[PDB]
Design a binder for this molecule. Structure first.
Ligand SMILES: CC(=O)N[C@H]1[C@H](O[C@H]2[C@@H](O)[C@@H](CO)O[C@@H](O[C@H]3[C@H](O)[C@@H](O)[C@H](O)O[C@@H]3CO)[C@@H]2O)O[C@H](CO)[C@@H](O)[C@@H]1O
Ligand SMILES: O=c1ccn([C@@H]2O[C@H](COP(=O)(O)OP(=O)(O)O)[C@@H](O)[C@H]2O)c(=O)[nH]1
Ligand SMILES: [Mn+2]
Length: 273
């Protein structure tokens, strides 16, 4: 009986003011966002969204950034009329970080919850400044964080595909998901760009005004040093993507916590092999 949501949401108010200098109380955010259900799940009451979106955040030791993320994104995702859930993929242990492997985990685990057909991969410290910037999937892979304050409100290079992005289930599968062996900082986003290009796709983007994005200024994380093998790795994506990714992934889930505003999956993704 519920009709389809309008194709573009009429609830959008456009540009927004974003500030990171006050404290955030998640209990309060939960009260300001009463329609968000346990585990950070929301679909609209009045219409059926065609967008079944799992939002996937790679994570370790960024609780403060995360509270800001939840405070800003949650009202925006409801105005966009999405059928969505938030997944924070928490890396167990204190060995070298692996951003892309955590993303793969999030894809695979979120599918166990619900028939998601769209995946948004979002770093924890990026907040969109304009709710016209749609956090859902298109017929090509979507790069969302296109105009970040830290790159002067434009793309750092035209093939940049870091920060926030959205792939439909079919696009993510078509590239065998993300690489598992980018350990430490950098390059895995370029590798993923390569993968899309090698499977016949191109990058869809909003314009630079709608795509405006703030990055929470923060200092360097321990245990995520620039990976010095990144430049070699990106040069060989075409060959490696064939057998590195979804089809070579294992991990061990240690703990699943359903909090009011998000599901946190704590996972042992191991160390380099
Ligand atoms: C592989 C990698 O590290 N990718 C990250 C990306 O780094 C690239 C980016 O900094 C661009 C321009 O900003 O420069 C790239 O290096 C080039 C240098 O410009 C140049 O001095 C050298 O001669 O050639 C290089 C290749 O043309 C650099 O690799 O930056 C983004 C955002 O910080 C990360 O998301 C990527 O992981
Ligand atoms: O110790 C870490 C390292 C990074 N990340 C996540 O990985 C993303 C990318 O790392 P980073 O912040 O270093 O990129 P930068 O903006 O500094 O270039 C972050 O936004 C977080 O989501 C994290 O949670 N803990
Ligand atoms: Mn950052």
């Amino acid at each position: 009986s519920l009709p389809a949501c309008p194709e573009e949401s009429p609830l959008l108010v456009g540009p927004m003011l974003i500030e990171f200098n006050m404290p955030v109380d998640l209990e309060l955010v939960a009260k300001q966002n009463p329609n968000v259900k346990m585990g950070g799940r929301y679909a609209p009451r009045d219409c059926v969204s065609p967008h079944k979106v799992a939002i996937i955040i790679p994570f370790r030791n960024r609780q403060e950034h995360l509270k800001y993320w939840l405070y800003y994104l949650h009202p925006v995702l409801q105005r966009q009329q999405l059928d969505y859930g938030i997944y924070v993929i928490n890396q167990a242990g204190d060995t070298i970080f692996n951003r892309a492997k955590l993303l793969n985990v999030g894809f695979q685990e979120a599918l166990k919850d619900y028939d998601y057909t769209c995946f948004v991969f979002s770093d924890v410290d990026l907040i969109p400044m304009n709710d016209h910037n749609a956090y859902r999937c298109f017929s090509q892979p979507r790069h969302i964080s296109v105009a970040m304050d830290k790159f002067g409100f434009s793309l750092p290079y035209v093939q940049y595909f870091g920060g926030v992005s959205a792939l439909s289930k079919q696009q993510f599968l078509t590239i065998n998901g993300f690489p598992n062996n980018y350990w430490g900082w950098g390059g895995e986003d370029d590798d993923i760009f390569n993968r899309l290009v090698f499977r016949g796709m191109s990058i869809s983007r909003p314009n630079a005004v709608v795509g405006t994005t703030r990055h929470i200024r923060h200092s360097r994380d321990k245990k995520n040093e620039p990976n010095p093998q990144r430049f070699d790795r990106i040069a060989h994506t075409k060959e490696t993507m064939l057998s590195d990714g979804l089809n070579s992934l294992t991990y061990q889930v240690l703990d699943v916590q359903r909090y009011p505003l998000y599901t946190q999956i704590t996972v042992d993704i191991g160390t380099p092999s």
